[PDB]
């Protein structure tokens, strides 16, 4: 696989809705006298307080606090939680602070389920090193998108409870390259933030190159729970205090905990921070990028910085007792120790630049390649003289040309402009060289893991030894890094972090080279699927080691301007651009023709401000020293000449300002698009008008618009012709240029609306290659379609890029073009590339549909469902009365349709339901299409036992982490395949698909939910299938299916107890009761609510008739009782008795362990197990039962044995058939054709869900539900499970 995944809108910089929740449970061992504590919780600037507790050292609150944000993930993690015991706070007095505990959101989120539970917050006096410990405050925390103190601390691993105060020195020396503010001078000062404490240097007025040589001194507890420092170059404008740039120092990459690791240190070395545009806009909408809230769009400033964390002894009297952020003159160092100053030379070559927006391509456009302070001559820098060349940094303004209505292209063609920059940077190439080595190893690890996952999920053989070879290559790469990075250990201009961090990666990857060989033995033929997920734990640490805090050279920016106004940008990091003689030290984007996509600056690159590509460039880049420009043209496309400028005429080492091209290979691209599927709904009808517009270099071609479908089959090859590819064959065969496929809805105005985008790489054939298998012809395989943030479709294509031949286009294999003469210029996908189509009969069970939401404050009385698959389709019977009978009057009605032979290439079968209005205007009220037909392909083949079962499920929990009845430790539909044995369930949709800014949510699209079954088989059909359709052609495969007809059904619910219910009251002990909604019937136990109970025991039994299957929709709920207003809601759950009732699993009544009619084991099913087995025999078309003696039975070709006799409550021996009958119920899977499993009498663990707090647990409930139809013999009297 070489197909790219270049997403224009990644997760970085995306803001999401977030919630922080805190319960302040209690406090104990508080140090002091007569304190009356008010616990204060501050997250950011939002501060809340508890209630009043009077004169205690051990208070109890159990109070709740909720805060909500909508910020980017890195913005959240710097925010500080400030739980504090504050003695005697009121509105006029800031109370006397006992102690506090500063600890950020990122440490919460680093916990595996993002929570801390019942843990004691280690409060300490934050403004005194010598003050004692200030007790512990038991609390719990949660961030969502035993009671001993030492066993339950609120700390991560490694942190001692007796934390040591340490001075967190940061040193601010000098800065360079500052932009304009005043009209246009600058007045800088640097402000540092850490754990709410701030410290700023003195302002040096009127200097682009300041030199403070000052430092900011914090005082905080080692190890720091606040995890980043906000270092921010700032301008001291007196009216508007505005920032220039911001870099975050990450504490984990500069440290390793323990004596085996090292204390944190950094620098003194340069730091490259970014922000808004290079010019000073009078109003700057990218001011948030100056604040570091997102990705920086242009380089703002660079700043030498240091870090000198030193641990103090808390009992030392000579130290300063205050923890304030003092301002102190630092100790300056020479700039030679930061790196020997060297000259660097950038090279760039613009080959192609297409896909320019039509709204901006009216005028001649200019590029601008910049690296840091150098290469920005057009903007008029505040640069001094040479610390020289004119620094040609712009392509000439060239008139664009039209590709289509959407996009332009640039007529570079034979002339490719080039840009070369002189720059001066400190030589710190090893920080990016080791990053390149370990990034190459991590890229190989990514490719191996993705190949193993893709090849595992396609079930191609031999996976685990391939994974073992991947980890063997990983071990070889570990040894390669062990040998490579040691070659310049004795460098003199080297910081302490460059020693200790390097030692850390040496130790880690030395261990990793043997952990790979250990997990090589751990990976087997059956454990490969989960050890593959275990393998990327290595990849997490390797990606973490790959990035480094010490910057040397800032990132290379490529810009766009017309009228010298910036419209589009890109930012490639410079670490992949250095040239090195070591292949692992060589950057990934260096000396290679790299595809790169521009995007809009700031917040307007996301969402509805633009979805179109700003530009697509085949940019060549190179970076290195000015003495290393020896062979920097080795990766360029050959067959070219160089045109140079006046400053470097005749010099062999001088780079050209432009190239003129002598080789123009004619290339024809056969773009085979056959199908798209699961697309976005851009039209108001819940469907779209999709067509594929494919871009390749300077031209574009369009397939014809298909109408009113989300799974189009265009079946349309487009032949791009007479295009020009430059260079030789070795730059195209193993790495062709990219293909961008864009999907659009042909709307009512004529102008199309955006639908998505996918990328591709064609299989390349030169004229000397034979068009022979296994390479040619190219097979169809999928391409994931993205519409920016979210996935919005899947496309099927088999692109091949072919040379236009030495004699003509006829040297290519002959095009199997338009045999259908009406197609004309539209031309089909040829045979061999299209799949073989074999006829499959599709059989639909039109069972019914429930749970329609009341759109337009009513319900549709006459719905009818049409199924459409690959053009062909069938329709059900029209509903004559929906509320009386929500079930179609149709048997298994089928249609025969040509389908793809390969099962992975099956199209999504569409299901839609319409209201049958006048004139055949079939207005859609629901539509669901997402299914894979391989699933539907058919080929012929009381307390006394309860507490014992409680001990049993404790054993089941302890074995999972390492009489009687069954206990399921998860939800009942998890064990029993959701009772979807043949009565399948699908979920309908309506409206436009939910874009994050233009559309609704996906829950708002939910309108109905279909019940039915699908059976797919070939029309050349097998022999047992010929028997099955033989008994009834009106049912097909569906023989012996029970009737649809409605019935009154008794609903019998036993509820045992509830556990760990979330209280709404601030005391922490709710007042719950059981509330049951069944169909349209309300039953509440509010008169018998169990007050003041976290784990109440109900023991109530409820019998209530329902109009099944219309009333087969039940919720079992718990309600915190409240007389005033309404009772607070805890949570509900979905039951849906319909899939229980008609299942073969016998969900009507559970079966006990052994047959007994006395005491706590009395057979509660009114129909005895012998009659149960006879019923399952006639319903399962299997002969039986055939009892001999009461201890044995023959059912089909199988024999079951067991006991024979039972005593009643009178103690008299009654021999019945029921014992071996119930034993056969517990061996009912032995039947070779109809065998299955039966539901036993059980108890169940039920998650409760509240839409007030979605996606998280509200408590558990234990219960089990039986039900009985009212034409069978009458149910037994309601049993009682009242507690002891």
| 534 and 622, same domain (yes or no) | no
d(CA 326, CA 36): 33
d(CA 596, CA 615): 8
d(CA 205, CA 192): 19
d(CA 547, CA 253): 8
Q: What share of the chain is helix, strand, coil (3-state, %, to 5)?
A: 15, 35, 45
- Residue 327 corresponds to which tokens in the numbers above? 């301002």
- CA distance to 687, 710, 865, 915, 1232, per residue, from 921 (Å): 15, 19, 14, 8, 50
Query: In this structure, is the dihedral angle defined by the CA atoms of residues 273, 276, 277 and 279, taken in order, positive or negative?
Result: negative
d(CA 704, CA 467): 44
The secondary element (H helix, E strand) that includes residue 850 is strand 837-850
- 1133-1136-1142 Cα angle (round to 5): 150
* Any domain includes 379: yes
d(CA 601, CA 286): 8
State the structure-solving technique. Answer: cryo-EM
| 996 and 861, same domain (yes or no) | yes
| 1223 and 1260, same domain (yes or no) | no
Q: Is 193 exposed, middle or buried (0-12, 13-18, 19+ CB in 10 A)?
A: buried
- Contact present, 372 and 346 (Cβ < 8 Å): no
Residue ending a domain, choose from 116, 136, 162? 162
Return the CATH number at 236: 2.60.40.150
DSSP 915-941: EE-GGG-EEEEEEE----TTTTB----
* Any domain includes 534: yes
| 326 and 357, same domain (yes or no) | no
List the one residue out of 1270, 1274, 1245 whose CA is nearest residue 1260: 1245
CB atoms within 10 A of CB 1150: 18
- Residue 574 corresponds to which tokens in the numbers above? 């410079």
| 304 and 407, same domain (yes or no) | no
- Residue 865 corresponds to which tokens in the numbers above? 């469902």
CB atoms within 10 A of CB 1214: 11
List the one residue out of 806, 738, 797 whose CA is nearest residue 766: 806
- Contact present, 1191 and 1178 (Cβ < 8 Å): no
- Residue 641 corresponds to which tokens in the numbers above? 């000449």
d(CA 631, CA 625): 12
- Residue 81 corresponds to which tokens in the numbers above? 């939680």
| 202 and 293, same domain (yes or no) | yes
* Any domain includes 424: yes
CB atoms within 10 A of CB 232: 24
CB atoms within 10 A of CB 534: 12
Q: Is 620 exposed, middle or buried (0-12, 13-18, 19+ CB in 10 A)?
A: buried
- Contact present, 369 and 419 (Cβ < 8 Å): yes
- Contact present, 361 and 400 (Cβ < 8 Å): yes
* Any domain includes 1148: no
- CA distance to 259, 571, 763, 800, 1004, per residue, from 355 (Å): 56, 18, 22, 21, 36
d(CA 390, CA 379): 14
- Contact present, 365 and 562 (Cβ < 8 Å): yes
- CA distance to 32, 197, 335, 337, per residue, from 308 (Å): 35, 17, 18, 16
Phi then psi dihedrals of residue 484, to 5 deg: -85, -45
List the one residue out of 395, 738, 440, 413 whose CA is nearest residue 595: 738
- CA distance to 217, 328, 474, 1251, per residue, from 169 (Å): 5, 10, 39, 48
CB atoms within 10 A of CB 844: 25
Domain count for the chain, please give it. Answer: 8
**8-state DSSP, 127:** T
DSSP 151-176: GGBS--TT--SSPEEEE-EEEEEEEE
Phi then psi dihedrals of residue 865, to 5 deg: -105, 130
d(CA 668, CA 689): 28
d(CA 1106, CA 1048): 6
Q: Tell me the three-class secondary structure of 405-432, residue by residue.
A: CCEEECCCCCEEEEEEEEEEEEECCHHH
* Any domain includes 238: yes
Return the CATH number at 1231: 3.30.160
d(CA 1181, CA 1196): 10
d(CA 281, CA 1196): 86
**8-state DSSP, 585:** T
Strands 910-916 and 922-928: antiparallel
Helices (H), 215-292: 287-290
DSSP 948-980: HHHHHHHHHHHHHH----EEESS-HHHHTGGG-
- 856-858-862 Cα angle (round to 5): 110
d(CA 682, CA 660): 45
Query: In this structure, is the dihedral angle defined by the CA atoms of residues 280, 285, 288 and 294, taken in order, positive or negative?
Result: negative
d(CA 350, CA 365): 14
Cis preceding linkage at 774, omega within 30: yes
Half-sphere exposure of 1230 (CA within 13 A, CB side): 14
* Any domain includes 1282: no
Helices 430-457, 463-484: crossing angle, 10 deg rounding: 180
d(CA 1239, CA 1172): 13
**8-state DSSP, 208:** S
Domain around 720: 665-811
* Any domain includes 1275: no
| 198 and 276, same domain (yes or no) | yes
Phi then psi dihedrals of residue 9, to 5 deg: -125, 85
Please list, in sequence order, all residues whose beta carbon lies within 8 angstroms of the beta carbon of residue 683, skipping any fewer than 6 positions away: 689, 745, 747, 992
What's the longest Cα–Cα distance across the chain? 118
- CA Rg value for the chain: 36
The secondary element (H helix, E strand) that includes residue 621 is strand 616-625
* Any domain includes 1052: yes
Tokens 């023709």 locate to: 593
- 272-274-280 Cα angle (round to 5): 125
| 756 and 872, same domain (yes or no) | no
For the chain, the straight-line distance linking the first and the last C-alpha, in angstroms and rounded, comes to: 66
Resolution value in angstroms:
3.4
What distance lies between CA 884 and its chain's CA centroid?
A: 44
| 306 and 355, same domain (yes or no) | no
Q: Is 342 exposed, middle or buried (0-12, 13-18, 19+ CB in 10 A)?
A: middle
Phi then psi dihedrals of residue 1003, to 5 deg: -70, -35
| 346 and 334, same domain (yes or no) | no
- Contact present, 865 and 886 (Cβ < 8 Å): no
| 1109 and 1009, same domain (yes or no) | no
Tokens 């004596």 locate to: 259
Phi then psi dihedrals of residue 469, to 5 deg: -65, -30
Residue ending a domain, choose from 518, 546, 574? 546
| 128 and 191, same domain (yes or no) | no
Residue ending a domain, choose from 546, 579, 598? 546
Three-state SS at 121: strand
């Amino acid at each position: 696989r070489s197909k790219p995944d270049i997403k224009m809108e990644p997760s970085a910089g995306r803001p999401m809705d977030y919630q922080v929740s805190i319960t302040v449970i209690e406090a104990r061992q508080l140090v002091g006298l007569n304190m009356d504590p008010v616990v204060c919780v501050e997250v950011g600037d939002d501060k809340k307080y508890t209630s009043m507790k009077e004169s205690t050292n051990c208070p109890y609150y159990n109070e709740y606090f909720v805060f909500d944000f909508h910020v980017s993930p890195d913005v959240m993690f710097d925010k500080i939680i400030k739980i504090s015991v504050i003695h005697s706070k009121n509105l006029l007095r800031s109370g006397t602070l006992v102690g506090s505990f500063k600890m950020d959101v990122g440490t919460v989120y680093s916990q595996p389920e993002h929570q801390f539970h019942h843990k004691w917050a280690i409060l300490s006096d934050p403004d005194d090193i010598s003050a004692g410990l200030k007790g512990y405050v038991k609390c719990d925390v949660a961030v969502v998108g035993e009671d001993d103190i030492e066993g339950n601390l609120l700390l991560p691993e490694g942190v001692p409870p007796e934390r040591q105060w340490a001075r967190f020195y940061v040193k601010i020396y000098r800065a360079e390259g500052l932009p304009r503010m005043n009209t246009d001078l600058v007045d800088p000062y640097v402000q540092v933030f850490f754990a709410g404490q701030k410290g700023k240097t003195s302002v040096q007025k009127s200097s682009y190159e300041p030199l403070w040589n000052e430092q900011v001194v914090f005082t905080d507890l080692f190890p720091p729970l606040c995890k980043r420092m906000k270092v921010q170059i700032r301008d001291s404008d007196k009216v508007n205090d505005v920032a220039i740039g911001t870099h975050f120092i990450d504490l984990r990459k500069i440290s390793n905990d323990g004596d085996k690791g090292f204390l944190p240190t950094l620098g003194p070395a340069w730091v490259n921070m970014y922000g808004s545009t290079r010019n000073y806009t009078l109003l700057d909408e990218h001011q948030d990028l100056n604040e570091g809230l997102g990705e920086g769009v242009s380089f703002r400033a660079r700043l030498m910085l240091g870090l000198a964390v030193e641990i103090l002894d808390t009992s030392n009297p000579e130290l300063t007792s205050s923890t304030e952020v003092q301002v102190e003159q630092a100790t300056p160092v020479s700039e030679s120790c930061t790196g020997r100053m060297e000259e660097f030379f950038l090279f760039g070559a613009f080959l192609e630049a297409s896909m320019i927006d039509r709204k901006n391509g009216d005028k001649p456009i200019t590029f601008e390649v910049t690296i840091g302070n150098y290469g920005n001559e057009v903007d008029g820098m505040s640069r001094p003289l040479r610390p020289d060349l004119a620094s040609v940094s712009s392509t000439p303004p060239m008139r664009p040309q039209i590709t289509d209505r959407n996009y332009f292209h640039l007529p570079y063609l034979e002339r490719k402009p080039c840009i070369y920059i002189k720059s001066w940077w400190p030589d710190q190439r090893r920080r990016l060289y080791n990053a390149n080595i370990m990034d190459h190893i991590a890229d190989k690890l990514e490719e191996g893991l993705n190949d193993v996952q893709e090849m595992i999920k396609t079930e191609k053989s031999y996976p685990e030894r391939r994974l073992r070879g991947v980890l063997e290559e990983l071990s070889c790469g570990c040894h390669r890094f062990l040998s490579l990075s040691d070659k310049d250990q004795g460098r003199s201009s080297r910081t302490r972090l460059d020693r200790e961090r390097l030692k850390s990666c040496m130790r880690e990857l030395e261990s990793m080279g043997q952990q790979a060989k250990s997990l090589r033995a751990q990976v087997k033929r059956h454990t490969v699927r989960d050890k593959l997920r275990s393998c990327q734990n290595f990849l997490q640490k390797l990606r973490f080691l790959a990035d480094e805090p010490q910057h040397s050279i800032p990132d290379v920016f490529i810009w766009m301007m017309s009228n010298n106004k910036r419209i589009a940008y890109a930012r490639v990091p410079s670490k992949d651009l250095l040239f090195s003689i070591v292949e692992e030290e060589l950057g990934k984007d260096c000396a290679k023709v790299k595809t790169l996509f521009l995007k809009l600056p700031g917040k307007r690159g996301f969402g509805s401000a633009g979805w179109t590509v700003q530009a697509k460039l085949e940019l060549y880049l190179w970076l290195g020293l000015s003495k290393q420009r020896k062979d920097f043209l080795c990766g360029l496309p050959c067959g070219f000449e160089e045109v140079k400028a006046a400053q470097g005429l005749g010099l062999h080492s001088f780079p050209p300002i432009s190239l003129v091209y002598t080789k123009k290979q004619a290339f024809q691209l056969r773009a085979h698009m056959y199908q798209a599927r699961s697309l976005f709904a851009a039209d108001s009808s819940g469907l779209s008008d999709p067509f594929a517009r494919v871009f390749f270099i300077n031209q574009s071609q369009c397939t014809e618009v298909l109408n009113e479908t989300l799974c189009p089959t265009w079946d349309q090859m487009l032949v791009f012709d007479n295009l020009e590819l430059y260079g030789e064959a070795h730059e195209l065969r193993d790495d062709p240029p990219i293909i961008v496929i864009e999907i659009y809805d042909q709307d009512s105005m004529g102008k199309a609306d955006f639908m998505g985008r996918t990328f591709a790489k064609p299989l390349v054939k030169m004229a000397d290659e034979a068009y022979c298998p296994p390479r040619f012809p190219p097979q169809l395989e999928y391409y994931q379609i993205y519409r920016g943030s979210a996935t919005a479709g899947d496309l099927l294509a088999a692109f091949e890029l072919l040379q236009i031949g030495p004699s003509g286009k006829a040297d290519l294999p002959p095009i199997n073009g338009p045999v259908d003469m009406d197609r004309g210029p539209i031309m089909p996908v040829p045979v061999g590339i299209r799949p073989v189509l074999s006829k499959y009969r599709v059989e639909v069970l039109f069972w019914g549909l429930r749970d329609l939401k009341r759109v337009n404050l009513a319900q549709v009385d006459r719905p009818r469902v049409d199924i459409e698959c690959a053009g062909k389709g069938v329709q059900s019977s029209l509903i004559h009365n929906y509320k009386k009978n929500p079930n179609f009057n149709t048997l298994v009605k089928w249609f025969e349709v040509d389908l793809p032979e390969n099962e992975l290439l099956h199209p999504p079968l569409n299901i839609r339901v319409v209201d049958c209005r006048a004139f055949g205007r079939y207005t859609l009220v629901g539509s669901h299409a997402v299914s894979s037909l391989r699933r539907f392909i058919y080929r012929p083949p009381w307390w006394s036992k309860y507490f014992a079962s409680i001990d049993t499920m404790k054993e089941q929990l302890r074995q999972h982490e390492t009489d009687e009845l069954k206990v399921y430790p998860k939800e009942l539909e998890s064990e029993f395949d959701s009772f979807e044995d043949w009565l399948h369930t699908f979920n309908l949709l309506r409206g436009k698909t939910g874009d994050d800014e233009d559309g609704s949510t996906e829950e708002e699209r939910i309108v109905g939910r279909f019940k039915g079954s699908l059976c797919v088989y070939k029309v050349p059909l097998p022999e047992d299938v010929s028997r099955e359709a033989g008994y009834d052609p009106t049912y097909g495969m569906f023989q012996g299916i029970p009737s649809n007809d409605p019935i009154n059904v008794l609903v019998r619910i036993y509820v045992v107890r509830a556990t760990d219910l979330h209280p709404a009251d601030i005391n922490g002990k709710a007042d719950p009761y059981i509330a049951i909604k069944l169909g349209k019937t309300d039953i509440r136990d509010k008169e018998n609510y169990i007050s003041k109970q976290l784990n109440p025991v109900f023991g109530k039994s409820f019998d209530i008739e329902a109009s099944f299957p219309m009333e087969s929709m039940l919720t079992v709920a718990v309600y915190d009782w409240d007389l005033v207003g309404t009772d607070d809601l805890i949570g509900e759950t979905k039951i849906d008795l319909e899939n229980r009732f008609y299942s073969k699993h016998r969900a009507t009544c559970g079966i006990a362990q052994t047959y007994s009619i006395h005491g706590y084991n009395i057979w509660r099913d009114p129909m005895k197990p012998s009659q149960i087995l006879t019923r399952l025999c006639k319903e399962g078309k299997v002969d039986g039962p055939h009892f001999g003696p009461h201890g044995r039975v023959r059912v089909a070709n199988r024999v079951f044995t067991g006991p024979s006799e039972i005593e009643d409550e009178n103690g008299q021996r009654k021999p019945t058939d029921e014992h071996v009958a119930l034993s056969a119920l517990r061996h009912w899977e032995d039947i070779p054709r109809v065998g299955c499993r039966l539901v036993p009498e059980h108890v169940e663990t039920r998650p409760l869900l509240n839409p007030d707090k979605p996606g998280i647990e509200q408590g558990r409930l234990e219960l089990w539900v039986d039900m009985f139809p009212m034409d069978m013999p009458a149910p037994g009297t309601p049993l009682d499970i009242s507690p002891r």
